[PDB]
Structures are given as C-alpha cells and as structure tokens.
C-alpha cells in the first residue's frame, strides 16, 4: 500500500474496468514487498487484427524502481489484454522475490 | 583506479613564508576557482593570530595540524562477515590533508564576522586543545579503540 501507479495509453484508450484489473494483479505481487517500492510504471499497447496487419497482439510493459537502487524490466506479449497483464505480474513476483533472497542471504 | 600508480603532484609553496603546508591549506578554502581572495582571508588571519598571541603564526599552524592529525581511522568492510568496521592506519600525506578538511569544515560552520575571523579563532582554539575539529578527532579515535578488535 501507499504506492503510486502510472498507466499509459500507447496505442489505445485506457478503460476503467481495465484499470481495475491492473491494480488487482500488481497489487498482489507488490503487496508482499510493499515496503521496498514507491511507484509502479505500466505501458499497455495493442497491435494487429483490425488495427494493423498480422495477428492481434497486446503488449504490457512494466518497469519498477524500488527504494534501494533496484531496477526491473518486464515485457511480454499475448493475444489478449488481460492475459498479457497476468504473465507480466508473474515475472515481477519472480524477480521481486529474487531480490529479497539476495538481501536476506546473510 | 585499477592502475594503482597515481602520479605524484608537484607540492608548491607560497611566496612569502616559502612552505608547502600553507599552500595545501589554501587550496581547500576556495570553491569557485579564485586564489587572490583566499590570501585576503589568510593573510588577514595569520596577522590576526599574531595580533592576539604575540608569536609567530607558523608554529601555531604547525601545532594545530600536529594535534588534529589522528593518524588512524575506521573503514567499513563486508568481504568477510556482515557490517564490520575495523581500524586502519593513515600515512603522512593523507593525514595532513585530512586535518585541513576538518579545520576549514568547522570554521565555516561556527559563527563569526568573516572567514578570516572564523579561521583565526579556529586555529587558535584548535591549538589550545579545545576545538570543534579536535572533537571529531576524539570521535574518530573513539571508534578505532572502541572496535579495536578486528570485528
């Protein structure tokens, strides 16, 4: 809790039901190490189908800057928007847990 | 750096007193790249020290560096174990410049009319035991003897 959030309509408009789905996922992965991070960067995109040529694909780029010189870069691609958000959140929880295991190595 | 062979700089001396200690003392005063103003801060100070003490200011300056110089310090290390601060000795040149920072550092902090007065009262007080820079020597020297064991 007490962490800001940044969305970005790269190639589309950000709806409200989508915004609720974003906060639900990263809210789980970040609530664990909530006292290490201050902000959450997000950038949603869309391509293909009716917009462009090729398969419909929606990207979700997520960057995270902790309170102690921590940098995370996560980028995945899926056929739907929610599925893209889900896969990235799993990657953040993996690397975000990797940091504590190194700090708590003793 | 990774070379380990730093060139030895040409330690110069002032025109009047012709000693290299004074020139090392001046180079820490300026911060915008001007030397003509530091002497107006210095030559007014050493004259003011002579006005008060009735003796050469050179010995008073040589005594202050002799008293504030700790010749020992503590550095943090965690190559073995977590959060260790064991002592470490200091050379002759390193301890010399190390005392200049503490003197001029305390002079800027303490109140006064000008840097010449703030610097004059610092050296005169620092030479006579009681000085804000001498307190930092005691604090740094305390941490060494406190953590005298290598742990």
């Amino acid at each position: 809790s007490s962490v800001k959030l940044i969305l970005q309509g790269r190639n589309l408009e950000v709806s409200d039901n989508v915004r609720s789905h974003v906060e639900d996922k990263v809210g789980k992965s970040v609530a664990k190490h909530s006292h290490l991070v201050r902000e959450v960067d997000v950038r949603l995109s869309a391509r293909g189908g009716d917009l462009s040529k090729g398969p419909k694909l929606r990207r979700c780029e997520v960057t995270l800057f902790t309170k102690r010189h921590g940098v995370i870069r996560a980028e995945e691609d899926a056929e739907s928007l929610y599925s893209s958000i889900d896969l990235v959140s799993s990657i953040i929880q993996r690397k975000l847990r990797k940091i504590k295991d190194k700090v708590s190595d003793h | 750096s990774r070379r380990g062979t730093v060139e030895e700089k040409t330690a110069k001396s002032d025109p009047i007193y012709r000693n290299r200690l004074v020139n090392m003392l001046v180079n820490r005063i300026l911060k915008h790249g001007k030397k003509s103003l530091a002497y107006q801060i210095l030559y007014r100070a050493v004259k003011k020290i002579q006005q008060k003490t009735e003796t050469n200011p050179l010995s008073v300056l040589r005594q202050a560096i002799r008293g504030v110089t700790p010749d020992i310090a503590v550095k943090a290390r965690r190559v073995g174990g977590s959060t260790h601060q064991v002592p470490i000795e200091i050379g002759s040149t390193q301890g010399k410049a190390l005392a200049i920072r503490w003197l001029l550092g305390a002079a800027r902090k303490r109140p006064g009319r000008n840097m010449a007065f703030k610097l004059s009262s610092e050296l005169v007080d620092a030479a006579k035991g009681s000085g804000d820079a001498v307190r930092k020597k005691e604090e740094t020297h305390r941490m060494a003897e406190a953590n005298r064991a290598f742990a």
Binding site: - | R148, A149, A151
Partner: protein, 110 residues
Amino acid sequence: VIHVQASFNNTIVTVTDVRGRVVSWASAGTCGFRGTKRGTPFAAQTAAGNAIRTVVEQGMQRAEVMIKGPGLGRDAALRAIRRSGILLSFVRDVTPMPHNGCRPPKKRRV
C-alpha cells in the same frame, strides 16, 4: 598453573595451583567484550593480561599453561603470558581425544 580454554565464541583463562584450587580467573566476557568480539585474538590478550597481572603481584613466578581446544586467541594469549615477568616449564595442551566415543551433531546446512 594457568588453564586456558580456547574457542570460536569465547576464551576462558583460569589460574590455579598444582593441587587444583583456583585463585583468580577472567575471560573475554568479563573484560567487556560480547558476541563475536570475544573469539577475536585481541580479546584473548586483554583477557589474559587482567587474569595474570594480579597473579604476578602475589609471587609465584613459576607457572604452567594448559591449553584446551582450538581458537584464534590461543596463540595470541601466549604473547600476553610471555609478555610478563614470569617463567614457565610446560606449554602442553590438555585437549580431549575421544576414540570414537559418542555421536557428534549433524552437519550444518547454511
């Protein structure tokens, strides 16, 4: 006699006569150290000095040191005992030697 027990967490120094009746003692903990600083070799020097200094005043120039166990302070304690005003005959180490007697603990994982 000067029984000394070395270890990684502490170093003990007990003085006693040949008959086995202690007169004085002091360890790194009594000196002021605590935690991991006790096992350091410097603590053995200061701990040994405070225990033997009172003994040199009360005569008994003769002495025998009985080392017991490993540690970093066992060698540093000799410098403390040697840097003194007493002679010595034995520098023997009365350590245990089990011939496969009991079961030791399990190995540590961390």
